[PDB]
Write an enzyme that holds these catalytic residues in place. Structure first.
Site, PDB file in Angstrom:
ATOM      1  N   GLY A 123       0.851  -1.180  -0.041  1.00 18.47           N
ATOM      2  CA  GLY A 123      -0.097   0.042  -0.076  1.00 18.47           C
ATOM      3  C   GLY A 123       0.872   1.403  -0.032  1.00 18.47           C
ATOM      4  O   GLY A 123       1.917   1.403   0.663  1.00 18.47           O
ATOM      5  N   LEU A 157      -5.542  -7.035   7.300  1.00 16.99           N
ATOM      6  CA  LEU A 157      -6.840  -7.492   6.670  1.00 16.99           C
ATOM      7  C   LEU A 157      -6.825  -7.905   5.341  1.00 16.99           C
ATOM      8  O   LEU A 157      -5.637  -8.534   5.044  1.00 16.99           O
ATOM      9  CB  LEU A 157      -7.678  -6.244   6.392  1.00 16.99           C
ATOM     10  CG  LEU A 157      -8.028  -5.593   7.948  1.00 16.99           C
ATOM     11  CD1 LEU A 157      -8.855  -4.441   8.100  1.00 16.99           C
ATOM     12  CD2 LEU A 157      -8.829  -6.650   8.956  1.00 16.99           C
ATOM     13  N   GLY A 202      -0.316   5.109  -0.369  1.00 18.56           N
ATOM     14  CA  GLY A 202      -0.766   6.472  -0.408  1.00 18.56           C
ATOM     15  C   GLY A 202      -0.105   8.035  -0.266  1.00 18.56           C
ATOM     16  O   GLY A 202       1.146   7.791  -0.253  1.00 18.56           O
ATOM     17  N   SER A 203      -0.682   8.787   0.088  1.00 20.19           N
ATOM     18  CA  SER A 203      -0.200  10.072   0.272  1.00 20.19           C
ATOM     19  C   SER A 203       0.444  10.312   1.638  1.00 20.19           C
ATOM     20  O   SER A 203       1.132  11.112   2.040  1.00 20.19           O
ATOM     21  CB  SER A 203      -1.173  11.182   0.057  1.00 20.19           C
ATOM     22  OG  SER A 203      -1.743  11.449   1.491  1.00 20.19           O
ATOM     23  N   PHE A 204       0.033   9.210   2.534  1.00 24.54           N
ATOM     24  CA  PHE A 204       0.380   9.223   3.891  1.00 24.54           C
ATOM     25  C   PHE A 204       1.656   8.713   4.265  1.00 24.54           C
ATOM     26  O   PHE A 204       2.302   8.820   5.245  1.00 24.54           O
ATOM     27  CB  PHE A 204      -0.419   8.470   4.597  1.00 24.54           C
ATOM     28  CG  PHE A 204      -0.676   6.922   4.184  1.00 24.54           C
ATOM     29  CD1 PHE A 204       0.159   5.991   4.319  1.00 24.54           C
ATOM     30  CD2 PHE A 204      -1.768   6.645   3.263  1.00 24.54           C
ATOM     31  CE1 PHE A 204      -0.049   4.632   3.506  1.00 24.54           C
ATOM     32  CE2 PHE A 204      -1.938   5.549   2.589  1.00 24.54           C
ATOM     33  CZ  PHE A 204      -0.967   4.397   3.045  1.00 24.54           C
ATOM     34  N   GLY A 205       2.195   8.021   3.142  1.00 25.71           N
ATOM     35  CA  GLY A 205       3.407   7.339   3.343  1.00 25.71           C
ATOM     36  C   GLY A 205       3.064   5.644   2.718  1.00 25.71           C
ATOM     37  O   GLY A 205       2.584   5.659   1.813  1.00 25.71           O
ATOM     38  N   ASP A 232     -12.599  10.549   4.517  1.00 24.82           N
ATOM     39  CA  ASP A 232     -11.895  10.140   3.305  1.00 24.82           C
ATOM     40  C   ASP A 232     -12.302   8.778   2.915  1.00 24.82           C
ATOM     41  O   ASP A 232     -11.529   7.948   2.624  1.00 24.82           O
ATOM     42  CB  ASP A 232     -10.400   9.976   3.398  1.00 24.82           C
ATOM     43  CG  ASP A 232      -9.857   9.826   1.704  1.00 24.82           C
ATOM     44  OD1 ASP A 232     -10.762  10.117   0.754  1.00 24.82           O
ATOM     45  OD2 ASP A 232      -8.784   9.507   1.586  1.00 24.82           O
ATOM     46  N   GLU A 269      -3.519  -5.136  12.598  1.00 28.51           N
ATOM     47  CA  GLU A 269      -4.194  -6.477  12.344  1.00 28.51           C
ATOM     48  C   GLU A 269      -3.993  -6.233  10.613  1.00 28.51           C
ATOM     49  O   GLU A 269      -4.699  -5.576  10.063  1.00 28.51           O
ATOM     50  CB  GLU A 269      -5.598  -6.557  12.624  1.00 28.51           C
ATOM     51  CG  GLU A 269      -6.562  -5.762  12.067  1.00 28.51           C
ATOM     52  CD  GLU A 269      -8.050  -6.197  12.667  1.00 28.51           C
ATOM     53  OE1 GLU A 269      -8.315  -7.227  12.729  1.00 28.51           O
ATOM     54  OE2 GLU A 269      -8.764  -5.198  13.262  1.00 28.51           O
TER      55      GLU A 269
HETATM   56  C1  LIG Z   1      -4.132   3.553   3.834  1.00 23.43           C
HETATM   57  O1  LIG Z   1      -4.306   2.620   4.479  1.00 23.43           O
HETATM   58  C2  LIG Z   1      -4.343   2.133   5.668  1.00 23.43           C
HETATM   59  O2  LIG Z   1      -4.433   3.374   6.599  1.00 23.43           O
HETATM   60  C3  LIG Z   1      -4.466   1.075   6.456  1.00 23.43           C
HETATM   61  C4  LIG Z   1      -4.635   1.027   7.613  1.00 23.43           C
HETATM   62  C5  LIG Z   1      -4.798  -0.463   8.091  1.00 23.43           C
HETATM   63  C6  LIG Z   1      -4.664  -1.423   7.426  1.00 23.43           C
HETATM   64 CL1  LIG Z   1      -4.547  -3.087   8.189  1.00 23.43          CL
HETATM   65  C7  LIG Z   1      -4.347  -1.228   6.197  1.00 23.43           C
HETATM   66  N1  LIG Z   1      -4.320  -2.550   5.571  1.00 23.43           N
HETATM   67  C8  LIG Z   1      -3.762  -2.349   4.010  1.00 23.43           C
HETATM   68  O3  LIG Z   1      -3.485  -1.498   3.546  1.00 23.43           O
HETATM   69  C9  LIG Z   1      -3.795  -3.894   3.696  1.00 23.43           C
HETATM   70  C10 LIG Z   1      -3.584  -4.089   2.299  1.00 23.43           C
HETATM   71  C11 LIG Z   1      -3.329  -5.422   1.755  1.00 23.43           C
HETATM   72  C12 LIG Z   1      -3.317  -5.420   0.223  1.00 23.43           C
HETATM   73  N2  LIG Z   1      -3.367  -6.539  -0.327  1.00 23.43           N
HETATM   74  C13 LIG Z   1      -3.663  -7.580   0.349  1.00 23.43           C
HETATM   75  O4  LIG Z   1      -3.560  -8.839  -0.300  1.00 23.43           O
HETATM   76  C14 LIG Z   1      -4.953  -9.710   0.087  1.00 23.43           C
HETATM   77  N3  LIG Z   1      -4.165  -7.455   1.776  1.00 23.43           N
HETATM   78  C15 LIG Z   1      -3.995  -6.645   2.414  1.00 23.43           C
HETATM   79  N4  LIG Z   1      -4.350  -6.318   3.719  1.00 23.43           N
HETATM   80  C16 LIG Z   1      -4.181  -4.998   4.523  1.00 23.43           C
HETATM   81  O5  LIG Z   1      -4.426  -4.943   5.568  1.00 23.43           O
HETATM   82  C17 LIG Z   1      -4.166  -0.092   5.439  1.00 23.43           C
END
Ligand SMILES: COC(=O)c1ccc(Cl)c(NC(=O)c2cc3cnc(OC)nc3[nH]c2=O)c1
Length: 344
Positions: free
Chosen positions: A31, A106, A33-36, A152, A104
């Protein structure tokens, strides 16, 4: 940059395999984005995978994530089962001059889900379940001692718990604030941005309901309802569907004249232009976009179960209550959950 640890964008230069603090084993980037960035990582101490959100090494970015953390911690410590619609912040820490939030793990987000079907859309039944969860999520956020505005909402910030089931969680409170502690004028992603924000007016929790409104239609049609290339395009696309916003709102709107003109007689129209680009106000009816009486969006659901004209008329009624132009009469989560689109 940061003794060679960061790129030129204030982002930590991720390295696969790296072990931080004799604990976390960075696998990879997942992941950005703009946050990092967000990486996948094994927590040796707890024997589980986690996602680590690495905040940009940059004072304004860090300062904002400190707000994300105060709100995440407030949500997570609230005793009610609804809190399980908001993601769990296990820990945070500083590492190499970046704030890192440990979550955690997801699964895929709703945008990925749409893409997985080639933007044909998910079922009205599936959409119902997502909507049902979102409104319970928003209801939680609306509890007085929280009053948190997400700011957002969009498919990319709603994630599946498990890739084959339909429980979801909201993530990314990196632009969130509490009611009455507002600090940006430009907010929400454009497609999902409310009229009050496009008009530079004060906003409350009702902006999340606008966003939800747009998301649910997209989840079902597979394309953004209002897909503007900039604020002027955005407000014109909304108008195509809902007509000119009512005079009481425009009259109090700082940015009314970015898009609209007041007439000698007190009514408002779109600005004069050079030249046809948009449908006339209010003539792109949600009724046809959804395909209420024509087999759903594109005719694609023709005689499938779960897609009766009556299902669609309910659905449509909810969306239009979600896209109410007035934030004080726009449907709030409590009542949205009582809507007949959720009967059994
Ligand atoms: C901006 O994103 C956030 O603030 C944020 C804040 C908390 C969380 Cl737990 C996340 N989680 C993920 O980005 C995430 C990205 C995944 C990408 N791909 C896959 O393949 C199945 N599984 C992922 N599972 C994830 O949890 C993002």
């Amino acid at each position: 940059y940061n003794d060679g640890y960061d790129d030129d964008n204030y982002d930590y230069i991720v390295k696969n395999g790296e072990k931080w603090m004799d604990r976390y084993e960075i696998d990879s980037l997942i992941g950005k984005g703009s946050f990092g960035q967000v990486v996948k990582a094994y927590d040796r101490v707890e024997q589980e995978w986690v996602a680590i959100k690495i905040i940009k090494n940059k004072k304004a970015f860090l300062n904002q994530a400190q707000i994300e953390v105060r709100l995440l911690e407030l949500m997570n410590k609230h005793d009610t089962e609804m809190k399980y619609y908001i993601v769990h912040l296990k820990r945070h820490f500083m590492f190499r001059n970046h704030l890192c939030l440990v979550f955690e793990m997801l699964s895929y987000n709703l945008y990925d889900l749409l893409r997985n079907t080639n933007f044909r859309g998910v079922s009205l039944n599936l959409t119902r379940k997502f909507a049902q969860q979102m409104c319970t999520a928003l209801l939680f956020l609306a509890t007085p001692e929280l009053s948190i505005i997400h700011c957002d909402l969009k498919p990319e910030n709603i994630l599946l718990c498990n890739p084959k089931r339909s429980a979801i969680k909201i993530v990314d409170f990196g632009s969130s604030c509490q009611l009455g502690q507002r600090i940006y004028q430009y907010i929400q992603s454009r497609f999902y941005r409310s009229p009050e924000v496009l008009l530079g007016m004060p906003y409350d929790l009702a902006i999340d309901m606008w966003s939800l409104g747009c998301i649910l239609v997209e989840m079902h049609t597979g394309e953004p309802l209002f897909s503007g290339a900039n604020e002027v395009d955005q407000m014109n696309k909304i108008v195509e569907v809902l007509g000119i916003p009512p005079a009481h709102i425009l009259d109090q709107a700082p940015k009314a004249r970015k898009f609209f003109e007041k007439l000698p007689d007190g009514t408002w129209n779109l600005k004069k232009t050079k030249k046809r680009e948009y449908k006339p106000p209010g003539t792109r009816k949600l009724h046809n976009i959804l395909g209420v009486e024509t087999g759903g969006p594109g005719g694609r659901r023709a005689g499938e179960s779960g897609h009766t004209v009556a299902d669609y008329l309910k659905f449509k009624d909810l969306i239009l209550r979600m896209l109410d132009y007035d934030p004080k009469t726009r449907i709030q989560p409590y009542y949205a959950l009582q809507h007949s689109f959720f009967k059994k």
